Every structure is written in C-alpha cells, then in structure tokens.
Design a protein around this nucleic acid. Sequence first.
RNA 1: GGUCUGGGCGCAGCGCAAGCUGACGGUACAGGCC
Length: 23
Amino acid sequence: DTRQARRNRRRRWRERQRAAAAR
RNA sequence: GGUCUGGGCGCAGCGCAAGCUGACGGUACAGGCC
C-alpha cells in the first residue's frame, strides 16, 4: 500500500459512511 | 443511479542520521462496467 492508496481508500470509507450516516 | 482501485502534489510536524505520518487539502484528479 501507499499513502495515496490509503488516502484515496480512506476518502471512500469516510465518504461512504457519509451516505449511510447522512442517509 | 451505483461500485471498485490508486497515483502524485503542497503544507506542517519530529531527528546527530535515517525515516514516516496527518477521518488534512481532497465532497480534489483518473479509469472501467452494469
């Protein structure tokens, strides 16, 4: 893995949870 | 309407050296399919 991948990935998790949380 | 992957740039912080990191930027950028 790399910082970007983690960043790119993490952004998914956070944002993904965003839909659920917001939803 | 949805899903999956990640690469590099800036800034900041720590150190005899070397070396890493930030639910930060970036809700950014890119590509594919149903």
